[PDB]
Structure 1
Amino acid sequence: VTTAHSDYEIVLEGGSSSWGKVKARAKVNAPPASPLLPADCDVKLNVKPLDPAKGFVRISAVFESIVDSTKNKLTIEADIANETKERRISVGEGMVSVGDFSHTFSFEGSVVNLFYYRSDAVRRNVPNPIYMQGRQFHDILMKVPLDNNDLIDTWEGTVKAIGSTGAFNDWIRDFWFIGPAFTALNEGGQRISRIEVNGLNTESGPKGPVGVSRWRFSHGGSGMVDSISRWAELFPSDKLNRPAQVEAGFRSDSQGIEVKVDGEFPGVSVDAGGGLRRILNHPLIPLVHHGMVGKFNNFNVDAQLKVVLPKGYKIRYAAPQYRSQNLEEYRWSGGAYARWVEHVCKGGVGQFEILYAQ
């Protein structure tokens, strides 16, 4: 058996608005590839524009999880804005808690994404470029009060390791990618440069010592890397005229995965030229990353996709072909759509573009 149930929905908006409701649920009768089971996780991404004057948006992310009966939590606030086309700045704070341990962090980081080439020959010839190589340069200043004994011990051990072990710059990449994260790094085309630590220090804060870490790293991609290949597409701050929230989670026991995701955010529909909008090109990193875990079991799939177009809009060239058009909402199920769903669950990055106009 191992049948895969999944329902996807897309409720779009017309005109210049690119917003769209995305809510999906999924049932898989297969064991998840987690060495600690069962694993449950809840994530809530809420974004609201602080000041539309120059791009401040307050993005909040809470990751509540329970893996093998230990309670995990990771809340992070961040005011992210674009200083320019290629540079982004994020200021905020956060908290991570595992079991009875919890350490609060604050950060001021800037990410600079640079494409290797900006050729107009490719841009004018390829209307829908997918692969786009480049690098991002993360310049992060993260601060953590050292009030726990475990925190102080971690800080002292890290300081000693950097002082003594000179290979820390590239040996941190082994620790920093837990388990299969390192393999996923190369699977998705990513590669991390050696970090460079611009300084570690501690000082008496509001109530005690705080570990201030000024460090820098950069990672580059060959085209699949959706953080790099599409830098401004992943962060639609300009078209965020109202609060956006995403609630997702999964209940993944030892004999099945129970996926649930909601969503309301801009950038769901992007113009493809000639007055023809489209569903945003599917991110490649999620597909190539899930393909390592989605290839472990032979599974039948009954996947259904709702695409509710706005009033008067019509889909032209949905491929795989949609099953049943109903007024202004469309359905995909079985046939080539089921084959494509299996293809992208197992690891494929095949194109399923839904062009539509009014």
Structure 2
Amino acid sequence: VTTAHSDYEIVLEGGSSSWGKVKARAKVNAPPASPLLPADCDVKLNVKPLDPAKGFVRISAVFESIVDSTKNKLTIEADIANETKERRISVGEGMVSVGDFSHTFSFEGSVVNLFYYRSDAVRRNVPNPIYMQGRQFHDILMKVPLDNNDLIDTWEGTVKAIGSTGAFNDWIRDFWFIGPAFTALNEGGQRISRIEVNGLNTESGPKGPVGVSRWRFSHGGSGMVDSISRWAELFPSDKLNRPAQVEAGFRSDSQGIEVKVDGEFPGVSVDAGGGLRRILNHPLIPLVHHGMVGKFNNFNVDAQLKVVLPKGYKIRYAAPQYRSQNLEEYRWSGGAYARWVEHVCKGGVGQFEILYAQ
């Protein structure tokens, strides 16, 4: 049987704005594919405009989890800006703590995104492009203070491994993507190149030695990768005129999974040409990645998508059909919507499109 109870809400804003509120609840009675149970997690994402002249924004992220009687925490906090429309700059710092061990770090990064082609026919014959092949290049300089015995041990072991073996650059990818993540890398459509180390140094600092490393890598995609094909959509620096948030939490166990999500941010709705707007095309990486854990138990589906529009907006060409119009709201439940939900909770990437106008 294994019913799957889920509850969704989108709330939009009028005019030329693109902001939106998102709310989500979920429940299943199926065992998660985690070789360590139970597992709990909360995520806070916040972002505020540092200053619009430079385009600089400040973004924070906090993770706590309890994984089989073990507390894990990861804090990161950074400043990001688009230096060009295909280069991005970031300066940030954070820390990671597991059990009793903990250490901080400060990074200094740049990212460059390149597409394999720029043909304008692809721009005048296809109104809604989806797949777009390209490659990203990351250049990272990170400094970590060495104060613990274990930090010094890791540092010396890494220096010895980098010095001695000639296949460090490609074997590091084995340690990098631990467990099933590596497998997804092939299927999710990505390709990680061999890293290239530009030098590991150690310098005296405030309290003691600090290990400085700078390295470069690249990863390409066939179009399914959102971070490449949709480089412009995922960092809306224009509409961040007020702080935005994303705030989620799951709590897994030996008998089903619990989900809870809030969010409010721009980029929810985009122009679709001819005066009509649309909900943004659903990202594909989460769908195909979750499809690797969603095929283990056949399940029953019930859900309710509830979309609230501003004054004077109408939904036209909603595929599949909605069920009710409470004069501003549209509700989807059962039938073809339920079939589509069951389809996408197993890795399917079929399109459920909503167009609205005024």
TM-score by length of 2: 0.99
Give the Å deviation of 1:329. 1.4
Please report how far the alpha carbon of residue 318 of structure 1 lies from its aligned counterpart in structure 2 after TM superposition.
Answer: 1.1
Cα distance between partner residues in 2 of 1:349 and 1:312: 31
Aligned mates of 2:6, 2:94 — CA distance in 1: 33
C-alpha distance after superposition, 1:215-266 (max 9, x if no partner)? 1111111111010010010111111111001110101111111011110011
Mapped partners of 1:331, 1:241: distance in 2:
30
Residues 141-198 of structure 1: per-residue CA shift (max 9 Å, x gap): 1111111111111111111111111111111111110101001111110110000111
Q: CA deviation at 1:58?
A: 0.6
Shift of 1:55: 1.2
The alpha carbon displacement at 1:93 in A equals 0.3
Unaligned runs of at least 5 residues, structure 1: none
Residue 290 of structure 1, CA deviation: 0.1
Residue matched to 2:343:
343
Give the Cα–Cα distance (whole angstroms) in 2 for the partners of residues 327 and 145 of structure 1.
59
Q: CA offsets per residue over residues 116-163 of structure 1, 9 Å max, x none?
A: 111111111111111111001010111111111111111111111111
Matched, 1:208 2:208: yes
Cα distance in 1, alignment partners of residues 68 and 320 from structure 2: 39
Q: Residue 281 of structure 1: CA displacement?
A: 0.4
User: What is the match of residue 252 of structure 2?
Assistant: 252
Q: Deviations over 1:60-82 (max 9, x none)?
A: 11111111111111110010110
Shift of 1:320: 1.5
Alignment of 1:108-257 (within 5 A): 108-257=108-257
Could you say what secondary structure the match of 1:262 adopts?
strand
Residue 23 in structure 1 maps to residue 23 in structure 2: yes
SS in 2 for 1:63: strand
User: RMSD over aligned Cα, in angstroms?
Assistant: 0.8
Q: 1:350 and 1:309 mapped to 2: Cα distance?
A: 24
Aligned mates of 2:320, 2:78 — CA distance in 1: 38
Write the distance in 2 (CA, Å) between the matches of 1:149 and 1:301.
52
SS of residue matched to 1:318: coil
Tell me the SS of whatever aligns to 1:89: strand
Please give the residue correspondences for 1:297-308 in structure 2 after superposition, counting only pairs within 5 Å.
297-308=297-308
Q: Secondary structure at the match of 1:75?
A: strand
Q: Which runs of 4+ in 1 moved over 4 A?
A: none
Structure 2 unaligned regions, length at least 5: none
SS at match of 2:354: strand
Q: 1:273 is paired with a residue of what secondary structure?
A: coil
CA distance in 2, matches of 1:307, 1:178: 39
Q: Deviations over 1:54-108 (max 9, x none)?
A: 2111111111111111111111001011000000111110111111111111101
Q: CA deviation at 1:211?
A: 1.2
Distance 1:205 1:338 in 2: 58
Shift in Å, 1:297: 0.8
Alignment correspondent of 1:74: 74
Report the CA distance between 1:310 and its aligned residue: 1.2
Q: CA–CA distance in 2 between the matches of 1:133 and 1:16?
A: 30
How far 1:14 sits from its partner (Å)?
1.4
Q: Distance between the aligned counterparts of 1:311 and 1:170, measured in 2?
A: 56
Q: CA deviation at 1:296?
A: 0.9
| Superposition TM-score, scaled by structure 1 size | 0.99
Distance 2:145 2:327 in 1: 57
TM-fit CA distance, 1:306: 1.3
Secondary structure of 2:220's match? strand
For 2:236 and 2:77, how far apart are their aligned partners in 1?
Answer: 18
Equivalent residue of 2:351, what SS? Answer: coil
Provide, for residues 16-47 of structure 1, a one-character-per-residue CA deviation record: whole Å limited to 9, x for no partner: 11110011010011111111111101110000
SS in 1 for 2:324: coil
Which residue number in structure 2 is paired with residue 265 of structure 1? 265
Q: In the TM superposition, what is the alpha-carbon distance from 1:315 to its structure 2 partner?
A: 0.9
In 2, the alpha carbon distance for the partners of 1:101 and 1:327 equals: 56
For residue 23 of structure 2, give the secondary structure of its aligned residue in structure 1: strand
Q: Percent identity?
A: 100
Q: Distance in 1 between matches of 2:85 and 2:251?
A: 39
Q: Distance in 2 between matches of 1:188 and 1:272?
A: 27
Q: Show CA shifts across 1:299-331 (max 9, x none).
A: 111111111111111111111211111111111
**SS of 1:154's equivalent?**
helix
2: CA distance, partners of 1:94 / 1:126: 43
Q: Within 2, Cα distance between the matches of 1:125 and 1:206?
A: 59
SS at match of 1:353: coil
Q: Distance in 2 between matches of 1:166 and 1:329?
A: 62
* Distance in structure 2 (CA, Å) of the matches to 1:74 and 1:335: 42
